[PDB]
Amino acid sequence: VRFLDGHTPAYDLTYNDVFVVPGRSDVASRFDVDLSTVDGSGTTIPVVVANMTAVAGRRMAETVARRGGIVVLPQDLPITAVSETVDFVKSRDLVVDTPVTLSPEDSVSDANALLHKRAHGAAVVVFEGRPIGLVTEANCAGVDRFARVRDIALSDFVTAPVGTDPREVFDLLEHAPIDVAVMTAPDGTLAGVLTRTGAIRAGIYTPAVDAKGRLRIAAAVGINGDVGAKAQALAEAGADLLVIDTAHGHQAKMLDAIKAVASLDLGLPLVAGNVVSAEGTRDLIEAGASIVKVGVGPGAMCTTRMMTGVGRPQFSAVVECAAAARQLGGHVWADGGVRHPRDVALALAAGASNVMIGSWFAGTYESPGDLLFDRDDRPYKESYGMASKRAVAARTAGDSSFDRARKGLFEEGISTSRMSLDPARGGVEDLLDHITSGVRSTCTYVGAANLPELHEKVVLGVQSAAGFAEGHP
Amino acid sequence: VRFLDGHTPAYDLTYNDVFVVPGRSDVASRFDVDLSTVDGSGTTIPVVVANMTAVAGRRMAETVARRGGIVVLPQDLPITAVSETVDFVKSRDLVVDTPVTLSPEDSVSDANALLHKRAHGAAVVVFEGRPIGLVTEANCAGVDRFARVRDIALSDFVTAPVGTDPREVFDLLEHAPIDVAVMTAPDGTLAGVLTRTGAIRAGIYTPAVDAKGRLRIAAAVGINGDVGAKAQALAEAGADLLVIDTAHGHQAKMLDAIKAVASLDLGLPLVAGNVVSAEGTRDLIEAGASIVKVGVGPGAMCTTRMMTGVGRPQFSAVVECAAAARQLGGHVWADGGVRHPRDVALALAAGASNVMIGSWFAGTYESPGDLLFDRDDRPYKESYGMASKRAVAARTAGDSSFDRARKGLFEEGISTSRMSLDPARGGVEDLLDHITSGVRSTCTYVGAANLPELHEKVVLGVQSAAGFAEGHP
Amino acid sequence: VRFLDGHTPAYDLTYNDVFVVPGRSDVASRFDVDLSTVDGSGTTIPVVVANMTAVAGRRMAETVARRGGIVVLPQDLPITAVSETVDFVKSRDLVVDTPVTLSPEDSVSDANALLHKRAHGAAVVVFEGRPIGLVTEANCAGVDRFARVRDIALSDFVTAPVGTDPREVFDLLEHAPIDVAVMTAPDGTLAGVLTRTGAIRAGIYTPAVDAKGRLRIAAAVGINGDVGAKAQALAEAGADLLVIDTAHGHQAKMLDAIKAVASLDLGLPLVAGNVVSAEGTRDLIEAGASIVKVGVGPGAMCTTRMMTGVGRPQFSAVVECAAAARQLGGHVWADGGVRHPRDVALALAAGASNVMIGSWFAGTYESPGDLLFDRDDRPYKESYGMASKRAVAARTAGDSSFDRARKGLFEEGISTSRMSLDPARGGVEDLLDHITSGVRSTCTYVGAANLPELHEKVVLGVQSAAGFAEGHP
Ligand SMILES: Nc1ncnc2c1ncn2[C@@H]1O[C@H](COP(=O)(O)OP(=O)(O)OP(=O)(O)O)[C@@H](O)[C@H]1O
Ligand SMILES: Nc1ncnc2c1ncn2[C@@H]1O[C@H](COP(=O)(O)OP(=O)(O)OP(=O)(O)O)[C@@H](O)[C@H]1O
Ligand SMILES: Nc1ncnc2c1ncn2[C@@H]1O[C@H](COP(=O)(O)OP(=O)(O)OP(=O)(O)O)[C@@H](O)[C@H]1O
Ligand SMILES: Nc1nc2c(ncn2[C@@H]2O[C@H](COP(=O)(O)O)[C@@H](O)[C@H]2O)c(=O)[nH]1
Ligand SMILES: Nc1nc2c(ncn2[C@@H]2O[C@H](COP(=O)(O)O)[C@@H](O)[C@H]2O)c(=O)[nH]1
Ligand SMILES: Nc1nc2c(ncn2[C@@H]2O[C@H](COP(=O)(O)O)[C@@H](O)[C@H]2O)c(=O)[nH]1
Numbered sequence A, B, C: 001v002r003f004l005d006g007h008t009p010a011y012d013l014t015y016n017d018v019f020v021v022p023g024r025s026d027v028a029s030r031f032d033v034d035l036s037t038v039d040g041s042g043t044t045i046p047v048v049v050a051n052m053t054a055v056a057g058r059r060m061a062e063t064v065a066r067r068g069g070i071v072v073l074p075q076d077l078p079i080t081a082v083s084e085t086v087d088f089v090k091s092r093d094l095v096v097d098t099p100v101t102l103s104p105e106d107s108v109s110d111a112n113a114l115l116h117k118r119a120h121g122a123a124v125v126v127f128e129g130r131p132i133g134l135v136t137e138a139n140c141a142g143v144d145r146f147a148r149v150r151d152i153a154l155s156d157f158v159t160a161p162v163g164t165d166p167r168e169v170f171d172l173l174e175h176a177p178i179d180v181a182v183m184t185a186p187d188g189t190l191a192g193v194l195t196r197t198g199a200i201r202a203g204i205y206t207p208a209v210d211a212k213g214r215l216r217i218a219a220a221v222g223i224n225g226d227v228g229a230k231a232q233a234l235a236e237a238g239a240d241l242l243v244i245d246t247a248h249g250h251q252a253k254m255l256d257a258i259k260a261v262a263s264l265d266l267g268l269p270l271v272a273g274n275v276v277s278a279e280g281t282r283d284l285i286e287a288g289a290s291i292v293k294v295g296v297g298p299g300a301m302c303t304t305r306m307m308t309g310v311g312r313p314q315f316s317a318v319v320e321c322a323a324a325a326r327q328l329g330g331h332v333w334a335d336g337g338v339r340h341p342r343d344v345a346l347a348l349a350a351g352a353s354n355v356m357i358g359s360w361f362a363g364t365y366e367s368p369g370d371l372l373f374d375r376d377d378r379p380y381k382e383s384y385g386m387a388s389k390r391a392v393a394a395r396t397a398g399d400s401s402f403d404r405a406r407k408g409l410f411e412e413g414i415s416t417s418r419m420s421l422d423p424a425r426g427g428v429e430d431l432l433d434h435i436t437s438g439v440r441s442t443c444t445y446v447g448a449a450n451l452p453e454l455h456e457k458v459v460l461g462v463q464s465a466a467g468f469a470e471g472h473p
Helices: A058-066 A079-090 A108-117 A166-172 A196-202 A227-236 A252-262 A278-286 A304-308 A314-327 A341-349 A401-410 A428-446 A451-457 B058-066 B079-090 B108-117 B166-172 B196-202 B227-236 B252-262 B278-286 B304-308 B314-327 B341-349 B401-409 B428-446 B451-457 C058-066 C079-090 C108-117 C166-172 C196-204 C227-236 C252-262 C278-286 C304-308 C314-327 C341-349 C401-409 C428-446 C451-457
Strands: A018-021 A047-049 A070-073 A122-127 A130-136 A158-161 A180-184 A190-195 A218-221 A242-245 A270-275 A291-294 A331-335 A354-357 A379-384 A416-420 A459-462 B018-021 B047-049 B070-073 B123-127 B130-135 B158-161 B181-184 B190-194 B218-221 B242-245 B270-275 B291-294 B331-335 B354-357 B379-384 B416-420 B459-462 C018-021 C047-049 C070-073 C123-127 C130-135 C158-161 C180-184 C190-195 C218-221 C241-245 C270-275 C291-294 C331-335 C354-357 C379-384 C416-420 C459-462
Touching: A018 A341, A018 A428, A047 A058, A047 A428, A058 A070, A058 A079, A058 A428, A079 A227, A108 A122, A108 A130, A122 A180, A122 A190, A130 A180, A158 A166, A166 A180, A166 A196, A166 B401, A190 A196, A196 A428, A196 B401, A218 A227, A227 A242, A227 A252, A242 A252, A252 A270, A252 A278, A270 A278, A270 A331, A278 A291, A278 A314, A291 A314, A314 A331, A314 A341, A341 A354, A341 A428, A341 A451, A341 B304, A428 A451, A428 B304, B018 B341, B018 B428, B047 B058, B047 B428, B058 B070, B058 B079, B058 B428, B079 B227, B108 B123, B123 B190, B130 B181, B158 B166, B166 B181, B166 B196, B190 B196, B196 B428, B218 B227, B227 B242, B227 B252, B242 B252, B252 B270, B252 B278, B270 B278, B270 B331, B278 B291, B278 B314, B291 B314, B314 B331, B314 B341, B341 B354, B341 B428, B341 B451, B428 B451, C018 C341, C018 C428, C047 C058, C047 C428, C058 C070, C058 C079, C058 C428, C070 C241, C079 C227, C108 C123, C123 C190, C130 C180, C158 C166, C166 C180, C166 C196, C190 C196, C196 C428, C218 C227, C227 C241, C227 C252, C241 C252, C252 C270, C252 C278, C270 C278, C270 C331, C278 C291, C278 C314, C291 C314, C314 C331, C314 C341, C341 C354, C341 C428, C341 C451, C428 C451
Parallel strands: A047 A070, A047 A354, A070 A218, A158 A180, A218 A242, A242 A270, A270 A291, A291 A331, A331 A354, B047 B070, B047 B354, B070 B218, B158 B181, B218 B242, B242 B270, B270 B291, B291 B331, B331 B354, C047 C070, C047 C354, C070 C218, C158 C180, C218 C241, C241 C270, C270 C291, C291 C331, C331 C354
Antiparallel strands: A018 A459, A122 A130, A180 A190, A379 A416, B018 B459, B123 B130, B181 B190, B379 B416, C018 C459, C123 C130, C180 C190, C379 C416
């Protein structure tokens, strides 16, 4: 990357320290920019969801993959749950979404709870697999909390067979009272739902699919235990990408795990991390990793800085590591500390092929945690860290229960953070709109038609603390 | 521009980052400074009101031009509404101001709401075009909300013929209970009003007038659609200056827009923006722009930094762009981020010929928005951005409503900020006093007698965060 | 009235002091109760809107009369304004309501301000008298404040010819996105609007109409000046009922005013007030009033108690005055202090034929005042008193500016109180539902099929401060 003349500070830079200078541009429209990645992940937008139990679930995996991202399932997820999750995602339709379903005998109180597991604003009542009506949050108000859903359900709703073009479904919903269109399978049973915004998004985002045309999903593994056997099972379970994840990636045990997995010739892209140095990036690639995950310190759930003083300002870390990886034909994932679209854009400008987002996506309907409301009625969800699941552990074979608590005494605890939902647009797809709208706008400011040109053409500069505060928050 | 020895930071500077070192001065008085601009705008003070619907209305256009500034009508204002505004502004008196007018049959409730559209402190009751009385906020207190204006109006007020010397009107109002002089035409109809402060300001500010002696006014146009026809239409409506405005000015579609307008030979100064680089300043001037508008990021309504990471600290943007425009015989407007008089002074010191002020002026009586009151009953008004009216858009001809919603999903939203009024001096002329009083003081401290001498003689320095904290807020 | 054995307190009673004891009832449902009054007012529900400028506007007069009440126009309204209000009200349809109308050239900012003049939730865009679309508050969000109505209007709306059965119009709106049906005259122009609730209300409420089938309206007159001439003009302007109104009704000047209006033999029912004594009730009836208005002290804008110590608890006042009026074949209106449906029910149980409501109805969309919002955006409007418009004043002939201020020094000021709108249901018709629903339930609890039977069969008891606190607020 190029920095403005004289911008060579005596410190490393975070996302807040830098800005992009616009260049001469012939890229007319935001939609002229190609946001697809070149690192082999298969993502059509530069967004990866972090391997965190607070974020990476079956609903998140489905929703983000349909919009071109990919979700890394958290490590130490039992292999039966992995295969169960993979089969669910890869059986999802590429356009039509999976709705919340209700029994006619479910209570209004139960319906109010389940409605916010998706962003559709309505749930479908099903009897013998067939949709019989729609349930909205409005129908649940002013009625007996334990009245049956059969009573308040709306019988009249827009329906269309699955496979109908999004533009047509969009037109059917124009004068509908409810913005949900129930999609019917060939035999008349429930296929899914498509909303007007969901139909628009189908003509904006390209789904991230495997060779069979099914949604992409990824899995992560720690460097403890038998890493080759675990990675092999994940591959056999259907994962399209593997992530070898640990807190300190520049470590002998991580180099072993990469070689053990690379030697199995699984044929999937191999991500490994995390490191913040060019030396660590090189060693991990030479061990057989095609993609290096970068980030030690910036994570929202990461207390490494205050515990150990170890860390690195993320933007500087991504610049040095992406340069090192590109010299060797590899790629870099910017992992941790992403709070705003500009963070994604700056990480791509810095040379990352993909940006990994964790805590930000906990504050969405589709994240696995329960929807909560703080003192001020504001909706939120809690993000929490993976703790010891990212740490190196000695062999617990033949471990006294004394030793179990001995090793547990020093191990990092699970910290918590409140992630509030946008009171208007609380779905993860709204944040993808947020993110990709910003990055597309960055490319038009830079003069780039795609992500490769963004990193090639970007001009960057450094600002003081008052510099970041320019504009509107 | 000269900086103190060794002040060569490794970053770009905002207005907060710099200060002016006083020089040796023989400039005797604040009033001996000449604030006229040399850029062909015609302003006699370096103040331009931004092309924003939240600020640039006809009341603002009249009031600012009479005091030497100029207002840029926002782009996409219908041409018929442009013509009414220009005709209203150019029919105003150069000394006497247009008051709020009331019918005798208006309700006290309506009168009370209309009083704050101006800063005179009284509205004039009119019958067949002639003044019959004055209405004040105090006359509206304690009366029935729907009593008629005729019952609370004062029939005793100071009156004088239009053209009376401001000095004499000032003396006629010395012992008047109401500080409003009602000015009449020879046939007795209302010509306007003049307060004691308005009489003082006539001897301080030079109106910005056209060749025919009528108040100056500008109009903005976006680079979408037919820019040439729109620009010509604005010229025929009577615009004294054209502003070709877009968020990213350094792109092909702007360069072609400037050329299409320049080749029509409309005979008006052409402004184009926004850019923040020397390369952009040169490319806009080469395409035919006479003035370059500078500012990407600093706008109080601008979310570009947080959305895209794109932007540049405004002070460094102006220094680099003013130098580039000067070598080509051009000029630079400093657009965005002005909150205090020092920002205007520093922008001029950096080499700008003129300073475009936006959201700050929304918090005035004369701005188009309604006067609001917060939880503490403080008066304020909402500023809001122009949003997609500054953005590039592909041709929308024959677009389906699906395609309309598609492009609409990613378009910039209208952000909102609250601009509080000074509970004492809430008129835009009070801000103009504030702004120009400080810019005149800056020149006396520097030793300059005019705006060019300010840029030539200024010595600047860089400070830390604590450096700005010195003094009083 | 009958009181429980031993309930003979040594004090007079407010509405909070008494409770109704259920009796044995054969009344099937609320709808079997006949709520029409027998005092000659013509109301079909026992609701009269007070003669107060904060409440009794033309929109209130139309809305309340269509639902069976009547509105008393405030005294001292110029006779020309009286005539226009009567003509407007008497030209309204008995079923279809008058909507808020907008031009396509109106601003969005003016649109959502005019929307709250009615409870429909939509305004009708009119082009040459023909309905071309609807504007909702949702359409005003997210667009430029000064955009035109043309840009946000919805061209799709349910329409039907005026005179269509309310049940049919109700069905046409079942699946409509907007709950407003645009009613058209045979030539296609806008006849009015009807909502699903508006159609329902047409089957519950009987419009209060004159002999020609036009909506009823009343007007008030003070006892100063030439009362006979004032009352004659109000009758010729079309008033269906006259209210002679003064703070202290038991005085010689009021008795003279009644005899002067009675001797004109205008043929209209004559209300006179206010008194709280049996002797006052008899003297006003014997002077020629057919209805005595009862209430000194309880009005929400009334500061009589704190200024003078004069006043009477309203329940005992009504009980004593209704009984005295009954012996002379007259009727009593309960004027002042109504805050809840219970107060209406208790006033009727006490023997009032009608209940006058003031400040409570100021907190509705249809009241004349502007809609306001407090610190928390909670909607409200201000109610204010009529003050000196209810007071005796000597002839102002030969009044020096000194004499005007002498009499104004002791004049009653205009008291103010904030009446909050119910955030769910802000129209006055929803309060009519609230009021008449409770009064109908009171009748079924007492076993009465109508208002006379309510007063004949009711059993009352007295409670302490803790007794009122029973139940839910
Ligand atoms: N057997 C398991 N052991 C440990 N963690 C599990 C197991 N099964 C699921 N999880 C975790 O529980 C969370 C819930 O995700 P999961 O995929 O089960 O569903 P989801 O996306 O929340 O959707 P739904 O609400 O429909 O179940 C995730 O963090 C997942 O990793
Ligand atoms: N026809 C129109 N279409 C869109 N915007 C308009 C139109 N007419 C005016 N505006 C906008 O409305 C705002 C106020 O315009 P106007 O000319 O009324 O100014 P003003 O000073 O507020 O005048 P006044 O207060 O006397 O009505 C400005 O933002 C202007 O751009
Ligand atoms: N000429 C007048 N003098 C004094 N008070 C008046 C006069 N005309 C109307 N009012 C008062 O103004 C209030 C509103 O009256 P009305 O509803 O007729 O006004 P409007 O302006 O036609 O209504 P809207 O706000 O619905 O347009 C009432 O309190 C009424 O008594
Ligand atoms: N130190 C630490 N880092 C964590 C933990 N859980 C996740 N992380 C890191 O933080 C990243 C997410 O960053 P975020 O998007 O929340 O800023 C993860 O991808 C991972 O690299 C944890 O418990 N401790
Ligand atoms: N990005 C962006 N810039 C805006 C918007 N509205 C106005 N601006 C810019 O900000 C300037 C005004 O800045 P202000 O004086 O309000 O800080 C305008 O002249 C224009 O250049 C908007 O919605 N978005
Ligand atoms: N003392 C007094 N009574 C008033 C005033 N305005 C209205 N009233 C009385 O109060 C009644 C309304 O009572 P409310 O329904 O507001 O409690 C009116 O009908 C009238 O009798 C005022 O300013 N002073």
